[PDB]
Design a protein around this ligand. Sequence first.
Ligand code: ARX
Ligand code: ARX
Length: 341
Amino acid sequence: SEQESVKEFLAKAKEDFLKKWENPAQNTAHLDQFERIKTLGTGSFGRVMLVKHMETGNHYAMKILDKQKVVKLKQIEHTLNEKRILQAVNFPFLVKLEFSFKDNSNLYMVMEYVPGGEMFSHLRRIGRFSEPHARFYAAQIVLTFEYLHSLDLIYRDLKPENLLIDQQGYIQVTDFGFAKRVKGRTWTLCGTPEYLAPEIILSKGYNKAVDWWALGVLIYEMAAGYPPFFADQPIQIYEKIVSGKVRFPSHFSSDLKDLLRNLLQVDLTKRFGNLKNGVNDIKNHKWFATTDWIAIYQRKVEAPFIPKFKGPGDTSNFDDYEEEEIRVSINEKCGKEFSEF
Ligand SMILES: N=C(N)NCCC[C@@H](NC(=O)[C@@H](CCCNC(=N)N)NC(=O)CCCCCNC(=O)[C@H]1O[C@@H](n2cnc3c(N)ncnc32)[C@H](O)[C@@H]1O)C(N)=O
Ligand SMILES: N=C(N)NCCC[C@@H](NC(=O)[C@@H](CCCNC(=N)N)NC(=O)CCCCCNC(=O)[C@H]1O[C@@H](n2cnc3c(N)ncnc32)[C@H](O)[C@@H]1O)C(N)=O
Protein backbone atom coordinates (compact mmCIF):
# COMPACT_ATOMS: atom_id res chain seq x y z
CA SER A 1 0.00 0.00 0.00
CA GLU A 2 1.45 3.33 -1.14
CA GLN A 3 -0.37 5.30 1.60
CA GLU A 4 0.98 3.37 4.66
CA SER A 5 4.39 3.40 3.03
CA VAL A 6 4.60 7.23 3.08
CA LYS A 7 3.66 7.39 6.82
CA GLU A 8 6.05 4.62 7.82
CA PHE A 9 8.85 6.34 5.82
CA LEU A 10 8.01 9.69 7.54
CA ALA A 11 7.82 8.07 11.04
CA LYS A 12 11.26 6.55 10.62
CA ALA A 13 12.75 9.79 9.20
CA LYS A 14 11.46 11.60 12.33
CA GLU A 15 12.98 8.98 14.62
CA ASP A 16 16.38 9.30 12.87
CA PHE A 17 16.29 13.12 12.90
CA LEU A 18 15.35 13.25 16.63
CA LYS A 19 18.11 10.84 17.67
CA LYS A 20 20.70 12.91 15.74
CA TRP A 21 19.10 16.11 17.10
CA GLU A 22 19.59 14.98 20.70
CA ASN A 23 23.10 13.43 20.30
CA PRO A 24 24.95 15.60 17.70
CA ALA A 25 28.44 15.84 16.13
CA GLN A 26 31.01 18.55 16.88
CA ASN A 27 34.81 19.20 16.51
CA THR A 28 34.89 16.77 13.58
CA ALA A 29 37.97 18.48 11.93
CA HIS A 30 40.61 21.27 11.66
CA LEU A 31 41.39 23.89 8.97
CA ASP A 32 44.97 22.59 8.41
CA GLN A 33 43.57 19.30 7.08
CA PHE A 34 42.22 21.14 3.98
CA GLU A 35 43.82 22.84 1.00
CA ARG A 36 41.86 25.81 -0.31
CA ILE A 37 41.23 25.72 -4.04
CA LYS A 38 38.71 28.31 -5.22
CA THR A 39 35.86 30.53 -4.11
CA LEU A 40 32.44 29.11 -5.14
CA GLY A 41 30.25 31.82 -3.59
CA THR A 42 30.43 35.11 -1.70
CA GLY A 43 28.14 36.64 0.88
CA SER A 44 27.96 39.42 3.46
CA PHE A 45 29.29 37.42 6.45
CA GLY A 46 31.00 34.48 4.83
CA ARG A 47 32.07 32.62 1.72
CA VAL A 48 31.96 29.08 0.35
CA MET A 49 35.15 27.51 -0.96
CA LEU A 50 36.23 24.39 -2.83
CA VAL A 51 38.70 22.64 -0.54
CA LYS A 52 40.58 19.36 -0.76
CA HIS A 53 40.92 17.09 2.26
CA MET A 54 44.65 16.21 2.21
CA GLU A 55 44.40 12.72 3.88
CA THR A 56 41.76 11.41 1.44
CA GLY A 57 42.21 13.73 -1.57
CA ASN A 58 38.43 14.25 -1.48
CA HIS A 59 36.91 17.64 -2.39
CA TYR A 60 34.38 19.51 -0.29
CA ALA A 61 32.57 22.84 -0.19
CA MET A 62 33.61 24.61 2.98
CA LYS A 63 31.34 27.39 4.15
CA ILE A 64 33.43 29.97 6.05
CA LEU A 65 31.55 32.48 8.24
CA ASP A 66 33.14 35.48 9.87
CA LYS A 67 32.14 35.29 13.52
CA GLN A 68 32.04 39.08 14.07
CA LYS A 69 29.93 39.71 10.99
CA VAL A 70 27.49 36.95 12.09
CA VAL A 71 26.99 38.75 15.45
CA LYS A 72 26.57 42.23 13.83
CA LEU A 73 24.15 40.94 11.21
CA LYS A 74 22.19 39.24 13.98
CA GLN A 75 22.68 35.73 12.62
CA ILE A 76 24.03 33.80 15.69
CA GLU A 77 20.88 31.81 16.37
CA HIS A 78 20.39 31.29 12.59
CA THR A 79 23.93 30.09 12.21
CA LEU A 80 23.54 27.67 15.11
CA ASN A 81 20.19 26.40 13.63
CA GLU A 82 21.98 25.77 10.30
CA LYS A 83 24.70 23.48 11.67
CA ARG A 84 22.25 21.68 14.04
CA ILE A 85 19.67 21.02 11.35
CA LEU A 86 22.26 20.04 8.74
CA GLN A 87 23.96 17.49 10.98
CA ALA A 88 20.56 15.92 11.89
CA VAL A 89 18.74 15.63 8.54
CA ASN A 90 19.13 13.01 5.81
CA PHE A 91 17.33 13.23 2.46
CA PRO A 92 18.47 12.68 -1.14
CA PHE A 93 17.98 16.35 -2.21
CA LEU A 94 19.64 17.96 0.79
CA VAL A 95 23.39 18.70 0.82
CA LYS A 96 25.46 16.53 3.25
CA LEU A 97 27.31 18.26 6.09
CA GLU A 98 30.51 16.18 6.53
CA PHE A 99 32.58 18.19 9.06
CA SER A 100 32.11 21.26 11.26
CA PHE A 101 34.43 23.18 13.59
CA LYS A 102 35.51 26.64 14.65
CA ASP A 103 38.65 28.59 15.32
CA ASN A 104 39.29 32.09 16.73
CA SER A 105 37.90 34.00 13.73
CA ASN A 106 35.49 31.61 11.95
CA LEU A 107 32.87 28.92 11.84
CA TYR A 108 33.39 26.11 9.35
CA MET A 109 30.74 23.92 7.73
CA VAL A 110 32.24 21.40 5.34
CA MET A 111 29.73 19.97 2.89
CA GLU A 112 29.99 17.38 0.16
CA TYR A 113 30.93 19.21 -3.04
CA VAL A 114 28.10 19.46 -5.64
CA PRO A 115 29.98 20.10 -8.95
CA GLY A 116 27.15 20.93 -11.35
CA GLY A 117 26.86 24.55 -10.09
CA GLU A 118 23.71 26.55 -9.11
CA MET A 119 20.41 26.23 -10.92
CA PHE A 120 20.60 30.05 -11.11
CA SER A 121 23.49 30.06 -13.70
CA HIS A 122 21.88 27.33 -15.81
CA LEU A 123 18.58 29.21 -15.81
CA ARG A 124 20.08 32.57 -16.71
CA ARG A 125 22.18 30.96 -19.43
CA ILE A 126 19.32 29.17 -21.19
CA GLY A 127 16.42 31.66 -20.74
CA ARG A 128 13.80 29.44 -19.15
CA PHE A 129 13.20 25.79 -18.46
CA SER A 130 10.54 24.16 -20.59
CA GLU A 131 7.59 22.80 -18.48
CA PRO A 132 8.70 19.08 -18.18
CA HIS A 133 12.24 20.36 -17.27
CA ALA A 134 10.83 22.76 -14.57
CA ARG A 135 8.49 19.95 -13.31
CA PHE A 136 11.42 17.56 -12.75
CA TYR A 137 13.06 20.12 -10.45
CA ALA A 138 9.81 21.16 -8.80
CA ALA A 139 8.99 17.51 -7.95
CA GLN A 140 12.26 17.33 -5.97
CA ILE A 141 11.52 20.49 -3.96
CA VAL A 142 7.98 19.20 -3.26
CA LEU A 143 9.39 15.95 -1.74
CA THR A 144 12.07 17.93 0.06
CA PHE A 145 9.51 20.21 1.78
CA GLU A 146 7.23 17.31 2.65
CA TYR A 147 10.23 15.71 4.44
CA LEU A 148 11.37 18.92 6.24
CA HIS A 149 7.85 20.02 7.14
CA SER A 150 7.13 16.54 8.63
CA LEU A 151 10.11 17.21 10.95
CA ASP A 152 8.67 20.70 11.75
CA LEU A 153 11.47 22.36 9.80
CA ILE A 154 10.74 25.48 7.75
CA TYR A 155 13.38 26.17 5.06
CA ARG A 156 12.78 29.86 4.27
CA ASP A 157 15.40 30.49 1.58
CA LEU A 158 14.19 28.79 -1.60
CA LYS A 159 15.66 30.33 -4.77
CA PRO A 160 17.73 29.04 -7.75
CA GLU A 161 21.01 30.11 -6.17
CA ASN A 162 20.50 27.56 -3.34
CA LEU A 163 19.66 24.69 -5.71
CA LEU A 164 22.82 22.94 -6.82
CA ILE A 165 22.87 20.40 -9.67
CA ASP A 166 24.74 17.15 -8.92
CA GLN A 167 26.55 14.87 -11.45
CA GLN A 168 23.28 12.99 -12.10
CA GLY A 169 21.47 16.26 -12.79
CA TYR A 170 19.48 16.09 -9.56
CA ILE A 171 19.11 18.95 -7.05
CA GLN A 172 20.83 19.38 -3.68
CA VAL A 173 19.45 22.16 -1.49
CA THR A 174 22.24 24.16 0.17
CA ASP A 175 22.13 27.02 2.78
CA PHE A 176 20.14 26.26 5.94
CA GLY A 177 20.95 29.67 7.49
CA PHE A 178 17.25 30.60 7.69
CA ALA A 179 15.95 27.06 8.45
CA LYS A 180 14.17 26.65 11.73
CA ARG A 181 12.38 24.09 13.78
CA VAL A 182 8.87 25.47 14.35
CA LYS A 183 5.73 23.57 15.33
CA GLY A 184 3.40 26.60 14.99
CA ARG A 185 4.23 30.25 14.25
CA THR A 186 7.48 32.23 13.93
CA TRP A 187 8.20 35.96 13.44
CA THR A 188 11.70 36.71 12.00
CA LEU A 189 11.75 38.87 8.92
CA CYS A 190 14.07 36.94 6.68
CA GLY A 191 14.27 35.45 3.18
CA THR A 192 14.93 36.86 -0.28
CA PRO A 193 12.67 39.75 -1.36
CA GLU A 194 11.41 38.09 -4.61
CA TYR A 195 10.56 34.88 -2.72
CA LEU A 196 8.85 36.35 0.41
CA ALA A 197 5.22 35.41 1.06
CA PRO A 198 2.91 38.45 1.72
CA GLU A 199 2.57 37.39 5.39
CA ILE A 200 6.33 37.80 6.02
CA ILE A 201 6.34 41.23 4.37
CA LEU A 202 3.35 42.37 6.48
CA SER A 203 5.10 41.52 9.73
CA LYS A 204 2.61 38.78 10.52
CA GLY A 205 3.58 35.62 12.44
CA TYR A 206 3.71 32.82 9.91
CA ASN A 207 4.23 29.11 9.33
CA LYS A 208 5.59 26.52 6.88
CA ALA A 209 3.11 27.84 4.27
CA VAL A 210 5.70 30.47 3.32
CA ASP A 211 7.69 27.58 1.78
CA TRP A 212 4.83 26.65 -0.54
CA TRP A 213 4.40 30.26 -1.65
CA ALA A 214 8.15 30.33 -2.43
CA LEU A 215 7.65 27.05 -4.42
CA GLY A 216 5.12 28.95 -6.53
CA VAL A 217 7.66 31.71 -7.07
CA LEU A 218 10.39 29.16 -8.00
CA ILE A 219 8.13 27.30 -10.44
CA TYR A 220 7.05 30.52 -12.17
CA GLU A 221 10.72 31.56 -12.34
CA MET A 222 11.89 28.22 -13.81
CA ALA A 223 9.13 28.23 -16.49
CA ALA A 224 9.17 31.99 -17.24
CA GLY A 225 12.92 32.65 -16.58
CA TYR A 226 12.21 35.61 -14.26
CA PRO A 227 10.20 35.70 -10.97
CA PRO A 228 6.49 36.85 -10.87
CA PHE A 229 7.09 40.04 -8.73
CA PHE A 230 10.11 41.98 -9.96
CA ALA A 231 11.28 45.55 -9.42
CA ASP A 232 14.65 47.30 -9.26
CA GLN A 233 14.16 48.26 -5.57
CA PRO A 234 12.98 45.82 -2.81
CA ILE A 235 10.33 48.28 -1.58
CA GLN A 236 8.40 48.00 -4.90
CA ILE A 237 8.97 44.19 -5.00
CA TYR A 238 7.09 44.09 -1.63
CA GLU A 239 4.19 46.20 -2.96
CA LYS A 240 3.78 43.79 -5.87
CA ILE A 241 3.86 40.61 -3.75
CA VAL A 242 1.22 41.95 -1.33
CA SER A 243 -1.49 42.69 -3.95
CA GLY A 244 -0.61 39.29 -5.45
CA LYS A 245 -1.54 40.44 -8.96
CA VAL A 246 0.41 37.98 -11.12
CA ARG A 247 0.58 37.79 -14.91
CA PHE A 248 1.60 34.61 -16.65
CA PRO A 249 3.51 34.26 -19.98
CA SER A 250 1.19 33.15 -22.83
CA HIS A 251 3.22 30.00 -23.22
CA PHE A 252 2.37 28.70 -19.65
CA SER A 253 -0.04 25.76 -19.80
CA SER A 254 -3.48 26.05 -18.19
CA ASP A 255 -2.39 23.39 -15.66
CA LEU A 256 0.72 25.41 -14.70
CA LYS A 257 -1.32 28.63 -14.25
CA ASP A 258 -3.91 26.76 -12.15
CA LEU A 259 -1.13 25.32 -9.95
CA LEU A 260 0.62 28.68 -9.57
CA ARG A 261 -2.66 30.41 -8.81
CA ASN A 262 -3.03 27.96 -5.87
CA LEU A 263 0.55 28.39 -4.56
CA LEU A 264 0.68 32.15 -5.09
CA GLN A 265 -2.46 32.49 -2.97
CA VAL A 266 -2.42 35.52 -0.60
CA ASP A 267 -5.23 33.85 1.39
CA LEU A 268 -3.88 31.19 3.78
CA THR A 269 -7.18 29.24 3.93
CA LYS A 270 -6.78 28.71 0.17
CA ARG A 271 -3.00 28.23 -0.47
CA PHE A 272 -2.08 24.64 -1.51
CA GLY A 273 0.18 22.84 1.02
CA ASN A 274 -1.73 24.69 3.79
CA LEU A 275 -5.18 23.03 3.29
CA LYS A 276 -6.50 19.88 5.00
CA ASN A 277 -5.09 17.54 2.32
CA GLY A 278 -1.57 18.90 2.92
CA VAL A 279 1.09 18.24 0.26
CA ASN A 280 -1.22 15.92 -1.69
CA ASP A 281 -3.08 18.90 -3.09
CA ILE A 282 0.19 19.66 -4.92
CA LYS A 283 1.23 16.05 -5.76
CA ASN A 284 -2.22 15.19 -7.08
CA HIS A 285 -2.55 18.43 -9.09
CA LYS A 286 -2.92 17.97 -12.90
CA TRP A 287 0.47 19.65 -13.67
CA PHE A 288 2.10 16.76 -11.81
CA ALA A 289 0.05 13.89 -13.30
CA THR A 290 2.99 12.43 -15.26
CA THR A 291 5.27 12.62 -12.20
CA ASP A 292 6.32 9.32 -10.69
CA TRP A 293 6.98 10.54 -7.12
CA ILE A 294 8.78 7.32 -6.06
CA ALA A 295 11.09 7.25 -9.10
CA ILE A 296 12.06 10.91 -8.48
CA TYR A 297 12.84 10.07 -4.82
CA GLN A 298 14.91 7.06 -5.94
CA ARG A 299 16.53 9.13 -8.68
CA LYS A 300 15.37 6.62 -11.31
CA VAL A 301 14.13 9.35 -13.62
CA GLU A 302 16.46 10.54 -16.37
CA ALA A 303 17.44 14.14 -15.66
CA PRO A 304 16.87 16.57 -18.55
CA PHE A 305 20.25 18.26 -17.93
CA ILE A 306 23.41 16.41 -16.86
CA PRO A 307 26.38 18.66 -15.97
CA LYS A 308 29.80 18.37 -17.63
CA PHE A 309 32.62 17.24 -15.23
CA LYS A 310 36.42 16.87 -15.62
CA GLY A 311 36.89 14.71 -12.53
CA PRO A 312 37.21 15.58 -8.83
CA GLY A 313 37.30 19.27 -8.01
CA ASP A 314 36.28 20.62 -11.40
CA THR A 315 34.78 24.13 -10.99
CA SER A 316 33.85 24.92 -14.65
CA ASN A 317 30.11 25.06 -13.62
CA PHE A 318 30.69 27.90 -11.12
CA ASP A 319 31.26 31.61 -11.78
CA ASP A 320 34.56 33.28 -10.73
CA TYR A 321 34.98 35.54 -7.69
CA GLU A 322 37.86 37.60 -6.22
CA GLU A 323 40.09 35.42 -4.09
CA GLU A 324 40.63 36.83 -0.57
CA GLU A 325 42.73 35.39 2.24
CA ILE A 326 41.34 33.36 5.10
CA ARG A 327 42.64 35.20 8.21
CA VAL A 328 42.71 33.38 11.58
CA SER A 329 43.29 35.70 14.55
CA ILE A 330 45.62 34.99 17.49
CA ASN A 331 42.80 36.04 19.86
CA GLU A 332 39.52 34.08 20.21
CA LYS A 333 36.61 36.21 19.01
CA CYS A 334 32.96 35.90 20.06
CA GLY A 335 33.58 32.82 22.18
CA LYS A 336 30.47 32.77 24.34
CA GLU A 337 28.19 33.52 21.40
CA PHE A 338 29.47 30.48 19.61
CA SER A 339 30.20 28.16 22.54
CA GLU A 340 27.31 25.94 21.36
CA PHE A 341 28.76 25.61 17.80
N1 ARX B 1 28.19 39.65 -3.54
C1 ARX B 1 27.94 39.55 -2.30
N2 ARX B 1 28.94 39.73 -1.43
N3 ARX B 1 26.69 39.29 -1.88
C2 ARX B 1 25.93 38.13 -2.32
C3 ARX B 1 25.12 37.50 -1.18
C4 ARX B 1 24.87 36.00 -1.37
C5 ARX B 1 24.01 35.34 -0.26
N4 ARX B 1 24.62 35.45 1.09
C6 ARX B 1 24.56 36.43 2.01
O1 ARX B 1 24.60 37.63 1.77
C7 ARX B 1 24.44 35.96 3.45
C8 ARX B 1 22.97 35.74 3.84
C9 ARX B 1 22.10 37.01 3.85
C10 ARX B 1 21.17 37.13 2.62
N5 ARX B 1 19.85 36.53 2.77
C11 ARX B 1 19.52 35.33 2.27
N6 ARX B 1 19.98 34.27 2.80
N7 ARX B 1 18.70 35.25 1.21
N8 ARX B 1 25.17 34.71 3.64
C12 ARX B 1 26.49 34.59 3.79
O2 ARX B 1 27.28 35.52 3.82
C13 ARX B 1 27.03 33.19 3.93
C14 ARX B 1 28.09 32.93 2.85
C15 ARX B 1 27.45 32.53 1.53
C16 ARX B 1 26.42 31.42 1.72
C17 ARX B 1 25.38 31.33 0.61
N9 ARX B 1 26.00 31.03 -0.66
C18 ARX B 1 26.13 29.74 -1.01
O3 ARX B 1 25.79 28.81 -0.27
C19 ARX B 1 26.69 29.49 -2.39
O4 ARX B 1 27.91 28.72 -2.27
C20 ARX B 1 27.93 27.63 -3.21
N10 ARX B 1 27.76 26.35 -2.49
C21 ARX B 1 27.14 26.20 -1.31
N11 ARX B 1 27.15 24.92 -0.93
C22 ARX B 1 27.79 24.20 -1.87
C23 ARX B 1 28.11 22.77 -2.07
N12 ARX B 1 27.75 21.87 -1.12
N13 ARX B 1 28.76 22.43 -3.23
C24 ARX B 1 29.10 23.37 -4.13
N14 ARX B 1 28.83 24.68 -4.01
C25 ARX B 1 28.19 25.15 -2.91
C26 ARX B 1 26.72 27.81 -4.09
O5 ARX B 1 27.22 28.50 -5.20
C27 ARX B 1 25.74 28.67 -3.32
O6 ARX B 1 24.93 29.46 -4.23
C28 ARX B 1 22.49 35.61 -0.35
N15 ARX B 1 22.01 36.81 -0.73
O7 ARX B 1 21.72 34.69 -0.05
N1 ARX C 1 12.52 27.51 -24.83
C1 ARX C 1 13.37 27.51 -23.79
N2 ARX C 1 13.39 26.51 -22.99
N3 ARX C 1 14.17 28.57 -23.63
C2 ARX C 1 14.23 29.62 -24.63
C3 ARX C 1 13.49 30.90 -24.31
C4 ARX C 1 14.18 32.08 -24.98
C5 ARX C 1 13.13 33.19 -25.13
N4 ARX C 1 13.07 33.96 -23.89
C6 ARX C 1 12.26 33.76 -22.86
O1 ARX C 1 11.44 32.85 -22.81
C7 ARX C 1 12.37 34.75 -21.73
C8 ARX C 1 13.59 34.43 -20.89
C9 ARX C 1 13.57 35.30 -19.64
C10 ARX C 1 14.90 35.24 -18.95
N5 ARX C 1 15.88 35.97 -19.72
C11 ARX C 1 17.19 35.70 -19.65
N6 ARX C 1 17.63 34.79 -18.90
N7 ARX C 1 18.04 36.45 -20.36
N8 ARX C 1 12.36 36.15 -22.19
C12 ARX C 1 11.24 36.72 -22.60
O2 ARX C 1 10.24 36.04 -22.77
C13 ARX C 1 11.17 38.23 -22.81
C14 ARX C 1 11.43 38.93 -21.48
C15 ARX C 1 10.19 39.44 -20.78
C16 ARX C 1 10.51 39.76 -19.31
C17 ARX C 1 10.41 41.23 -18.89
N9 ARX C 1 11.71 41.90 -18.79
C18 ARX C 1 12.02 43.02 -19.48
O3 ARX C 1 11.16 43.75 -19.97
C19 ARX C 1 13.46 43.44 -19.67
O4 ARX C 1 14.38 42.94 -18.67
C20 ARX C 1 15.25 41.94 -19.24
N10 ARX C 1 15.01 40.68 -18.45
C21 ARX C 1 13.82 40.11 -18.10
N11 ARX C 1 13.96 38.99 -17.35
C22 ARX C 1 15.28 38.82 -17.19
C23 ARX C 1 16.12 37.83 -16.49
N12 ARX C 1 15.54 36.80 -15.80
N13 ARX C 1 17.47 37.99 -16.56
C24 ARX C 1 18.00 39.04 -17.25
N14 ARX C 1 17.31 40.00 -17.91
C25 ARX C 1 15.96 39.94 -17.90
C26 ARX C 1 14.96 41.87 -20.75
O5 ARX C 1 16.17 42.00 -21.53
C27 ARX C 1 13.99 42.99 -21.04
O6 ARX C 1 14.61 44.11 -21.69
C28 ARX C 1 13.54 34.10 -26.27
N15 ARX C 1 13.28 33.73 -27.53
O7 ARX C 1 14.11 35.15 -26.00
